[PDB]
């Protein structure tokens, strides 16, 4: 799915949860802590950015690069031609890195849980968030 109305909703709630300044680090910590707890083998994928210490400056910069890329895709959800080009470039930064296919549904689940935790669960549209996040990661994975 991820309808035109869905994309407006996800854009609004993402900007709210992502936020400004150091609030972005608050959202990232929620994502990586959840992801590494659910999928502990994912931490080793980030050994070059010091995934053993997510509070380090090295990993926080990596985290904000990732969330920055997700923000960049979210903001372009209503601009599909540009989105497809953004995803194609992101794919080139992930291919043949040995990233397991399971990492992407796991990341989606952790990102949705963290946004849900930040903006509040009541009336949270999981169908809109899952379907639109799935359009993003299916362009990056594989």
């Amino acid at each position: 799915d991820c309808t035109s109305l869905n994309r407006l909703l996800v854009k609004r709630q993402w900007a709210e949860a992502y936020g400004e300044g150091t609030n972005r680090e608050l959202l990232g910590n929620r994502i990586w802590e959840d992801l590494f707890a659910n999928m502990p083998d994912a931490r080793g994928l980030f050994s070059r950015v010091n995934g053993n210490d997510i509070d380090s400056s090295e990993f926080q910069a990596h985290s904000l690069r990732v969330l920055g890329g997700l923000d960049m895709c979210v903001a372009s959800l209503d601009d599909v031609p540009v989105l497809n080009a953004l995803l194609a470039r992101l794919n080139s930064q992930h291919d043949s890195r040995g990233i397991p296919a399971a990492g992407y549904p796991a990341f989606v689940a952790s990102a949705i849980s963290a946004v849900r935790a930040t903006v509040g669960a009541r009336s949270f549209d999981n169908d809109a968030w899952n379907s639109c996040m799935n359009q993003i990661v299916s362009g990056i994975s594989g």
């Binding site: 972005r24 400056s57 910069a61 690069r65 960049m72 903001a75 080009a85 953004l86 470039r89």
Partner: peptide
């Protein structure tokens, strides 16, 4: 268009790191 957005969002990421310069220096 995607290149332009990619470059300038790189600035957005760095601008919002201005309140955590230790992370900004890494970036």
């Amino acid at each position: 268009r995607a290149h332009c957005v990619r470059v300038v969002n790189g600035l957005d990421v760095a601008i919002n790191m201005l309140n955590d310069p230790a992370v900004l220096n890494e970036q």
